[PDB]
Each structure stands twice: as structure tokens, then as C-alpha cells.
Design a protein around this ligand. Structure first.
Ligand SMILES: O=c1[nH]cnc2c1ncn2[C@@H]1O[C@H](COP(=O)(O)O)[C@@H](O)[C@H]1O
Ligand SMILES: O=c1[nH]cnc2c1ncn2[C@@H]1O[C@H](COP(=O)(O)O)[C@@H](O)[C@H]1O
Ligand SMILES: O=c1[nH]cnc2c1ncn2[C@@H]1O[C@H](COP(=O)(O)O)[C@@H](O)[C@H]1O
Ligand SMILES: O=c1[nH]cnc2c1ncn2[C@@H]1O[C@H](COP(=O)(O)O)[C@@H](O)[C@H]1O
Ligand SMILES: O=c1[nH]cnc2c1ncn2[C@@H]1O[C@H](COP(=O)(O)O)[C@@H](O)[C@H]1O
Lengths: 356, 356, 356, 356, 59
């Protein structure tokens, strides 16, 4: 009579959450050469990227240099907001002002590289958003840790009402079907997915809140797809196989953090330790980062992130090519000519024995 | 026809038990700022704490100093019984006799700090209980390792009949629905839950007996909530996320052990090892502690606890503030304005890959 | 339509196996003081031990001294058969020929200590069995690695027909319900259970054959209990909690290996390694031991055991007392007055998180 | 209403995959002595081996020396294709041209040793295959990493139409039932199974594509057995227990990789490190290996293999005898007189606790 | 060369010839490297017995 896990409510434990390590992609009938697979995918309803990768809006990942490199490589970059508004507007202008080297570069109708900017929630965030739109930003990301708040939805609706035809609006992080549906109703052009799985995240330890990434992507797609709203899987990706898994679950774009932090185009000074090279990497909720403009990320001290260092990886183009090659190999195995065909692939669930 | 795990009796393996690491809290529609969340909760049917934390009744955790500090911090402290009756009454008097900087201090009707005392089962325990009641204790915890015993229920009934109208009576550790129902029938004002999950506990190794804490809390709550009897989750809490999970499973109060052992207010001398500071922490059933007043906890040699050292943590106030901040973050994520609403949040079960 | 794990046959994967680490004993309504619990249990249909423990028939565990000590401690010892017949008969007579220090000692009608001996399968084994019966052994264990063989069953029937009224015959190791039923029909007085779970055993690695011990005990009890044939759990036991778990699963007696090899009474010299005292421990199918009278254990060199060292433990009485204290604690928690009541306790299955 | 793992599509997560560590062979009624079990099994529809083992077609495993040793031991060897066509034909001729020491030697009608050769896909592969056939090869393995491609099936049909009555054609790696059915329809004489589980493979990390080996064998066998097409399990085998499990899942032959890289007959110079003997072992798709005949395994840089060193194991005969002894022990435990009876054995699934 | 220049006419060699293949003893393999035993006549391994009169002898 009672639930086998305890209690009487069958919905007290909502579901069983799968992460990236719990699944593998099953091979299927393939007539696709990996070199000819089309990896282009929608970022928003009006923007299509040649490479379905986006740089995280973190102070140690994306600034003007990284944004330009990502835009040339085929993706896009989202500039962080841990700095004064005028400085972020200056970064946007630097990206917009900056031929055959980069056939995959992403550009607007005027031939200038695309760039995205992150804003918060509030009147100061409204002034920031208006300044960024005037500077010529292409897409605005309403970056909040928990986007199912009333204020986040109201801010997304106001931005779409004001500058909804000039720029695109992307909702904050969600992890459930209900939150994704609420963001879609508000009018977001895309939905960003993930609450908890960050590598530098301590939400699961400090707050005891989280959601495994594969299940969260599936639930959000289950709410976003009938309306044509793309999904951006944000956080938890460590290999190119994880990117392929995230895209096969229904996500149209993957946002990268630590995989791009150690590159040469990321900010921060290179550090030398015992003959090896490393670079800093900290979360926006870490004590060092919030000791400011971005401290309002979690409605603030109880830090919800950690600082660390990741090894130097070299130029960004090399990392992007490795990830795209892994994705192309996955597409060849699953017989997916396009990303829209990769989004229909099947998974096999593996036990703990397959991971040890 | 036969059970998949073996045999022919489907009730031989009663249920699948979930621990704190098996679940995460799912985000929900939130309209709550962490700084404005109300963390007050019921300890017994008549006592309400501003911070739902209670100190463990262990000789290395709670004495007069720790009890005063916990009562000032917004919670309460329970004095151990590993000492003669007169000394425990002296500790109670010291706490009661004892500052505008503490707005959250828990006080009785007369403005004196609240304190609790732990008693066992027996005629000596009855004399101890009478002395503590005369000394002015607020709550008596009938502390036994197995509270489903007949004698424990009889002692709880006797205490309620004698001094029930003056003090509250909390019943010892249970791990099933039937035991919680029996304690409620006996007349306990609150039920303490947990058999096995202690950090220094070896009941699972020595005796092979235990119960995962999340499932035990769910079962005990299903037994106690229809009568309005609060639940105190005791043991196994290592982070503020665990406190949030325990309160979301249904528990109204959490009792803290090793998290409080390394603070300044805890009894014990400071240990210096290689320039690092540690403090002693041992179970009340260990060889070094039972060698007596607590030796009768399991009707006793067979040690059922271990000794060890925990790193020095500093003042109690800092630790309590960090734990309460983590709890507030959880309340903000789940959209719970009060603890009574946090007790209705949903879980997501994660696999082994989610713990790697 | 197909099986979720693969193929179309739903019986290809017969069941899910639970080991000792997958379950815990659930506390129940108790009125039992651990000191007054009765640990007497049936070894065979006619022999009742004061302590439900038996020594393994291994050349590094049991000889005359260990058998004498075990019989005095309240259990019984089984002499290994890795030696000539005359030597084994001499060991039996040494035990039989050998005041108030040992009230729990096990004895026959003549007041002499009970002892058991292991025999193999064949004609030399028949001569060995007859010589041991003449020497005065009380129970014969037909020790084979796989007792579901036709030859082992026929040997058990022959022994029961010949010396049935003088000694008890215990069948070799089984791991399924069908094998237990086959041994019961052949006339065995006790069924010894376990194929794979030995600590020094490499059957699961070399042959890929095994069965988890909790499930195996449940399956074998489901066939032995209706006819009153006791079950002896052999192998995989590391703590007193495992002994309690094996007895609660239905076993009436546990056979101990490595828990007794490091004691003084076990054969072998005391090895000194970096100032620490160890003793040798090896399986009867190890390359060292099968180079011999135990070579017939696997119808055989393809070693199926390993050699190693176990720390010195001291006198056997102390180890037996520690194990019995753990068992008594389990009986107190589960509210079991006798072993027959312990055999009806319930398990809670734990996940992988509960083992980290 | 939704799927418990997320979304609304029940077929998104197709199945739960089992690997070798997840299962164990259950003992059954046995009349089989390990030394008298028949280990002969089919390789193709016309070739029967005495030992059901085949050497891998890798540049660090099999050449003329290893092929001859495997053919003398009772198995077979498949020559790698990372060298010019004339060189591979020379190796085949050397094997075909190279008394009672080897009673189990596998030979054709003309008394010469059997040998197999690996070919790719394309016109150059067609020329290679015709040259090898003109050199007297016995079986051709159409070797690809993903055999569900249209080109692979067409190549298999072409080879069977051309030289189908002289040599046998084995289809490359598959992991599902549909792929095995496609290879069977294409005319393959045997189907090789496994995509991902190689020890030197990085397909699961780079591409996120894979299939657990036990489940893949079960599915492929369900596809092939009604038509009498043998299944060769390739990859993931680390012990003789794994070989026994692979054969019990339905496979007729296991192809060995790292288990044969440290043998004396394996190509490559012996390497000394700190007085210990190791040998190099690398995949056919590794960066060093493809730096151009084998570069086309995955339609290729994005490496999908790794390099390393494995301990030197000595002569091949010793390893083959040890593996066969483990297989014989499994046959004795499961009561299987022949391999066709071992293929009907049952499994027991074990939990993670059984692996710790 | 120094010994011969000091005045000696011949040098008698010990350990410089112990490890040659023509010397008595068994080859020892340690971590893949080849060694040979070499002991003094007064050593405990050698004087434990003939040739105990080397120094009128156990120290
Ligand atoms: O301090 C933080 N805590 C939690 N999540 C963060 C923090 N800073 C950024 N994030 C998010 O978590 C993601 C982690 O990316 P990853 O390191 O690639 O897993 C980032 O891309 C952000 O979306
Ligand atoms: O010796 C002991 N054995 C088992 N449990 C104990 C012992 N001493 C205290 N406990 C309980 O275990 C809890 C451990 O708290 P923790 O250290 O926060 O897990 C205490 O609060 C007591 O409820
Ligand atoms: O060589 C061997 N191979 C496999 N099992 C063995 C061997 N020797 C003893 N055993 C079994 O393992 C038991 C002891 O296991 P332990 O209690 O884990 O040491 C014995 O009672 C036998 O049933
Ligand atoms: O470069 C490679 N990458 C991945 N798999 C490979 C490669 N080369 C060979 N294989 C396959 O992986 C298997 C590895 O065998 P194992 O080391 O016994 O698991 C081989 O027998 C081939 O079937
Ligand atoms: O046990 C011994 N003690 C002292 N001198 C020895 C002993 N054995 C040999 N010798 C002498 O010492 C010399 C050592 O020569 P070397 O090996 O060139 O140093 C030998 O050639 C002998 O003359």
C-alpha cells in the first residue's frame, strides 16, 4: 500500500534523474560520412549558428576577445555582467567593430560578428539592457540562477515588449517542464536549461537543490518543442560525448564553461606551476566573485561556487575543432544528417558497473 | 511467482531505503527572497524555535556553554546525561540563570533561556528526571537507542502523567512508522527519528541494524503528522543541504552532532597536530565513553560507536549562520515562505553516476 | 515486447542477487534485553549448538586445537581433509579424548566434545569416511564446491544408508533452490550454502560463476525449511552484522573462515612483518594447497583460491565473544527472543549511496 | 503521466544495458567434469574450431607469427590491414605454408592452417580482398567500426557473390538487433558484435556512443540464431569468466585483444622498465597508429583510441590453456557438456555492492 | 700506471676482474641488470673451514 521508498504520497519523489554518465547513444542505420554532417543549429528562433556551441557568460570565460573568437569559429559568445554597464557596452562595441580565414563565422545582416550580453533583474538591469541594445547587441540573456521567479518572467516580458523585434531574449536557467512552459508563455526566444550541475557549483551541497541534466533537458524540451522554442543546455559538459548526448536529448545549443576557460582567448593571466601552465576559473557565486555587480545572481554571504584552476589548452580554434569532430563522429554513428535528426536518437541506460 | 530477490515472501525485503545522497530538491515556482524566508519551526507541540536546530545530547557536544550559545543563536540545546544527577542539575541551573545582540534567542515565558535534558529508562532515570524538573528544565528527552521497547514507552507515559503539564517529553530514536505511532500513542510531544545513520555509529557494522534516514523520516512523519506531533531528524547530517532535505521530507527540527563538535562552545581541549587544530568527538556507546551513566543506553563490552577528531570550526554563531543561510537558499529555490511549506517540496532521485 | 535487458527470453536473467552489503535489519517491537537473548540454534536435525558458529574445514583454520576451542566456546569445528586418513582420524580422537571454565561446551551423551570432519567424493573418500566414523566423529560434511552433481548426491545417500544412525551427513555447497531440494531429497541432514562468496575465492573471476549470499540463503531456505533441514551459510561473512543478516535470512548456522584464521588456535606459524603479527590464510583450491588430498574439490591446475595474510587476533574465546555480542545486539534491536524469532525479521534494501 | 526518466516518449531510453560485471553464471545440475568438457564451437557456418577464440585484427596483436600460434592452439588469427596489400598477402602465404605436438591445430581440407584477413570498404579494399583470396585465405572479415552503413552491407554482398563459395565473409561490428539482421540478410557468414567496449577505445568519451556488451550480444543473437549465423563477441574481455559469460549470452566465439598483446608471439619489441617486461598496445584508430591503410576505420585528426603498455605474459600457449581452463570450470559448474549447452545457461544480475 | 711508476713491477687485481665471465660464481639478475658476487677471504660468508689461517683466527 505505501510507496516502496517510504511514506504514502507517490509523488513525493517526483522522478528518477539521469545525468550524462548514465546514458549512451545507440548506433543506428547510418549513411552519413562524419566529414559531411551538417552541424548547424538554431540558437534562437531567428539566429542560426554553424557550430552549436555558445560561450558561458562568466567573468573568466567570455569577454571581447573570446566573443570574437567564438563568433569567428561558428558559434557565439555571451559577455558577462560582472562589471559596470559602460564597460559591457564598450565590450559589445569592440565586438561589433571587429576575410577568407573563417568561412564559418556568424554575422548579422550587416556583415558584423554576432554577440550576446547577459543582464539581471531590476531597474539597474533595465538600464543595462537598454544601453546594450543601443550599443548593438544581438541577443540578451536574462541570466538568473532560478528563472521560475515572478520577477524574471516579468523582466523577460518587458524586454520582449520593448526591444523584442530588434534583439532576442533568452530566459534564465530552469530545470522543470513547468518553468520552461512559463518562460515560453512569457515570450522568451530560447530557454536555457540547468540548475545544479555546474562544475564549480555547490548548490547541491549548500542548498541541497539540483536536477540531473539529461532529465532536465528532456522535460524542458517536452515543454518548448511544440512552440518552436530552442533549448540551450548549460552546465555539466566535460567531453564532446556529453555535447552529443545533450543535443540528442532535444537541446539545440550547448553552453560551455570550463572547457573554454583554459584557452588563450579567455581572460586572466597565465600561471606557471612546476613547469606546467594553468589558468583561473571561478563561479559567479564564489566568494571572490561576489566580493559586486553580479552578487545579485542569487538574490543576495553564503557562497554557492568555488574557485580553482584548469590547465592551459591553447588556442580556442583547436578546442572548438576537437569538440566539433567528436560531435560529427556521434552524428555519423547515429546516422544523423542534421542536428534535427540527431535530436531523435535513442539512448541506452547503463548501470554503475559500466562506469567503474 | 517467486520474489525477484529470492524466496517466496514479498515482505521479507520490506522496502528500498533512500539516504540523503539519493535525493535532491526540485526547484519550483518561487516568489521568496532568501533574506525574507521564515525559518521558525515547532520543536514540540508547545515550543517554537526561530532556528530549527538542536544540539546533540552527547558528552563532547553539549554542556552549559553550548546550551547557552544554541539558545542565544535561535535554537536549543540538550544536556547530556554522562555525569551524576547533581552535576546535570547544576548545568541546567547555570543555563537558566544566564545582550541585545541576540534578537533570535529562545526564551520561556519568564525571559530565561530554554534548555533540554536527556534521561534514560529506570528508577535512577526517574530520580534524575524529577531533579531536572525541579531545577527548571523545559523539555525532557527520553534518550534510548531503540525506543520501540516496552520500558521506554512506559517511562514516557509516566513522565507525561507526572510532569506533563509543566515540561514537554520527547521520545527516543525510532526508524519505522509503527514505532512512531507507538510513541505518539504513549503521549510523546515530539518524536526523534534515526537508528543507524550517526557519523560515529557502528550499529550497521556491529549489529547489522539500521534504516536510511530519508525513508525513516518519511515513515515516521506518516505516523505522526495526523496528530500534530513534530519530528526531529537525528544523525547523518553533514551539510546544510542535508538539513534542507530532512526538513523537506517532513521533519520539523534537525539535531546536530559532528557539525557542532568542533566549535569553541563544545566541551573539550584543543588538539594541535602539525599546526592544525582538532577536537575530540566520540559516540556515547564507544568504549572510551561507556566506561557509568550512559552505559545503560543499550542495556549493557560491545562498543557500538567510535572515537575520533573533528577539525576546529570556531564560534558557534558562524556555523549556525552558515547552516541557516544554506537553508534559506533552499527555501528560496523551492519557493517556500515557511518551513511548513518546505515540508511539501518534491524530490528527484539520482543514481550512482550522480555521486561520482 | 522484448526483455528490457536484451533478447526475448525473460528467464535468461533469472533474478537480482542481494549480498550482505545490500540489506540492513529493520528494528521491530522489542522486549528483549541483549544479555538474556538465547543464541542456541540447530546445526543438524539432531545437534543443537549453544552458539550458531562453525569453523571452516580449511587447512589454515581448523585442526585439533581449533576444534577443541570451538567446541568449548559453544560451537563446533570441522577438520580439514587435506591430509592422509590416519592423520585425520588421529585429529578426531585427539578432540574426542580431551572444568567449569566452559559452561557452553558442546558434548555428546558420553560427555565428550562434539566434532565434525570433512570427506570428499569417491572411493578413497568412502574409506576415509568409514575410518572417521570408527574414530568417533559426530558429523560428516561432504565438502564439494558444486554439490548439485549426481555423484555428490549419490555419496550422501550412501553415507546416510551406511552410517545414518550414528552420524549426521551435511551436503556440500549449493546456491539455488533446486540444488537445495536435490540435497534434501538425498537425505542430507543439513545443507551448506554458498558458491562464490568466499573471501579467498576466485570462482567469480576465473569461471564467471557465483551467486550473492543473501539471495542464495533465501532460495535454499525456501526449499529446506518445510522438511526441517537446517541451512548453514558458508562464506562472505566479515562482521558480526553479517552473521546477524545471514541468520535473519533463514540460515540456522554460519561457517566462519577468515574471521578465525588469525587466532592463536589456528594452524600455522606467526609471521612477522614490519613489527606486526600476521598468519597465513589460503583457500583449499589455491595453488599452494592443491599441489595433495584437497585436489578433488573441483574434480581437477587452474587455481580457484588465493594466498594471503591476515592479522593476528588473539585467543579464540575473545573473537567468539565479540561476534556473539554483535548477534545479541541484533536480537535486541529486532525484538527476537530466540534464533527462530530472528529468522523472521525484515530487511530494508539500501542503495549505493548508503555504502559510500 | 510522463516517463519516470523524463519526457513523454517511452522509447527515448530504449533499454537498460548490462555489461560483463553486471551478471554471473548460475550453477545448475551438472554431470560434467571440467577436463572432459567439449569446447569446440562454430566460427562461421562452415568453420568449426576446437578452442572458440580468435585473435584480433590489430597491428599490435596479430601477424603471421600470432596467426600460426593461434591456429596451432586450436583457434584462429585474423591478420591486420594496416600494411600494403602485397605485405598482407605475404603474411597469408607464410601462414598457409608454415608433428603431434599440436593435436588441436585447425586446418583446412588440404592440411594447411586456417587464417583470416581483415579488409576495409571501397575499391582499394576490393583489390585487397581479391589479392588475399588469390593467396588462399580462408575467411575475410569486412572490418568497420559501424557495420550498419549501406556501404558495408553492399561490400559484404559483393564479396559473397564473388568468392562466396571459396571463403567465408564475416560482417563488421554491430551492437543492435536491426544491424545484425541487416548483416544476415546481406549474406554474412558470421556477425561480429561490439561497439564501444574496447579497453583501448574512447568512443564512449569522444562520441558518447556505445552499447554494453552483454545486452548487445543478447540482441544480436536474437537476430541471428533463427538463421544459424554465428555471433563473435569482440571487445571488453578481461578474464576467462568474461569469456564464459560471453559464450553463455549466445556468442559462439570471442575475439581477444589485450589478453594476447603481452604474449611472445605478438608483434612488437619487448620493452623493459625498472627490470619489468612490458609491450606496447594501441588501438587501430589511435593517433599514433593512423599516422594510412587503417586510417579509414571511422571514415577519417580525431583519435578514437589510446596507446599504452601491458605486462609481458610469455608464450601464447600458456595463456590459451589458462583461458580454456577457466571456460571448462564454467562448463562444469553450469552442467554444460558442449558450448551449445553453455549458450542456454542462466544469469543472475548483481548490484553495485557485489562489485565493491 | 701510478703503482707502476711508484716502483712496483706488477699489479695484482681484485674487483676489476671479479665481474668477468671467466671468474667463478653465478650471474645475478637484479632489476634486469647483471651482477656477480665478490667477497673477501676474511668475510663471514667465506671464512665459515678452509683458509681460516689468513689472520690466525670469529670477527
Ligand atoms: O558560481 C556559480 N554557481 C553555479 N553555477 C554557476 C556559477 N557560475 C556560473 N554558473 C553556471 O554553471 C555553468 C557551469 O558550466 P561548466 O563549468 O561547463 O559546467 C556556467 O556555464 C553557468 O551557466
Ligand atoms: O555511540 C553512539 N552510537 C550511535 N549513535 C550515537 C552514538 N552517540 C550518539 N549517537 C547518535 O548519533 C548522532 C550523530 O550525529 P551526527 O554526528 O550529526 O551524525 C547523535 O546526535 C546521536 O543521536
Ligand atoms: O579455494 C577455495 N576456493 C573457493 N572457496 C573456498 C576455497 N577454500 C575455501 N573456500 C570456501 O570459503 C569459505 C570461507 O570463506 P571466508 O569465510 O570468506 O573465509 C569456506 O568455508 C569454503 O566454503
Ligand atoms: O582504435 C581502435 N579503437 C576502438 N576500438 C578498436 C580499435 N582497434 C580495434 N578496436 C576494437 O576493439 C577491440 C579491443 O579488444 P579488447 O582490448 O580485448 O577489448 C578490438 O578487438 C577491436 O574489435
Ligand atoms: O678478506 C679480506 N680482507 C682483506 N684483504 C683481502 C681480503 N680478501 C682479499 N684481500 C686482499 O685485498 C685485495 C683487494 O683487491 P681489490 O679487490 O682490487 O681491492 C685482494 O686482491 C687481496 O690481496
Amino acid at each position: 500500500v505505501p510507496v516502496p521508498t517510504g511514506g504514502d504520497d507517490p509523488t513525493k519523489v517526483a522522478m528518477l534523474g539521469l545525468t550524462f554518465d548514465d546514458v549512451l547513444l545507440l548506433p543506428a542505420a547510418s549513411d552519413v560520412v562524419p566529414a559531411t554532417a551538417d552541424t548547424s543549429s538554431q540558437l534562437t528562433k531567428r539566429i542560426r549558428l554553424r557550430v552549436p556551441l555558445v560561450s558561458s557568460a562568466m567573468d573568466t570565460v567570455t569577454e571581447s576577445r573570446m566573443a570574437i573568437a567564438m563568433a569567428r569559429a561558428g558559434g557565439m559568445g555571451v559577455l558577462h555582467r560582472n562589471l559596470p554597464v559602460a564597460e559591457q557596452a564598450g565590450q559589445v562595441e569592440t565586438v561589433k567593430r571587429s576575410t577568407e580565414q573563417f568561412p564559418l563565422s556568424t554575422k548579422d545582416s550587416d556583415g558584423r560578428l554576432l554577440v550576446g550580453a547577459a543582464v539581471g533583474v531590476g531597474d539597474d538591469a533595465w538600464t543595462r539592457a537598454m544601453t546594450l541594445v543601443d550599443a548593438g547587441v544581438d541577443v540578451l540573456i536574462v541570466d538568473t540562477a532560478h528563472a521560475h521567479n515572478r520577477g524574471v518572467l516579468d523582466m523577460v516580458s518587458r524586454l520582449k515588449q520593448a526591444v523584442g523585434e530588434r534583439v532576442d531574449v533568452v530566459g534564465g536557467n530552469v530545470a522543470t517542464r513547468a518553468a520552461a512552459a512559463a518562460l515560453v508563455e512569457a515570450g522568451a526566444d530560447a530557454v536555457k536549461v540547468g540548475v545544479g550541475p555546474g562544475s564549480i557549483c555547490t548548490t547541491r551541497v549548500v542548498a541541497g537543490v539540483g536536477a540531473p541534466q539529461i532529465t532536465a533537458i528532456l522535460e524542458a524540451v517536452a515543454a518548448c518543442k511544440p512552440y518552436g522554442v530552442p533549448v540551450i543546455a548549460d552546465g555539466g559538459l566535460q567531453y564532446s560525448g556529453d555535447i552529443a548526448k545533450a543535443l540528442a536529448a532535444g537541446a539545440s545549443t550547448a553552453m560551455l564553461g570550463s572547457l573554454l576557460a583554459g584557452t588563450a582567448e579567455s581572460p586572466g593571466e597565465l600561471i606557471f606551476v612546476n613547469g606546467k601552465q594553468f589558468k583561473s576559473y571561478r563561479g559567479m557565486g564564489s566568494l571572490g566573485a561576489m566580493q559586486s555587480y553580479s552578487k545579485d545572481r542569487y538574490f543576495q554571504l553564503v557562497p554557492e561556487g568555488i574557485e580553482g584552476r584548469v590547465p592551459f589548452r591553447g588556442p580556442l580554434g583547436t578546442v572548438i575543432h576537437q569538440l566539433t569532430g567528436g560531435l560529427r563522429a556521434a552524428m555519423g554513428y547515429t546516422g544523423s544528417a542534421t542536428i534535427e535528426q540527431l535530436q531523435q536518437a535513442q539512448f541506452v541506460q547503463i548501470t554503475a558497473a559500466g562506469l567503474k
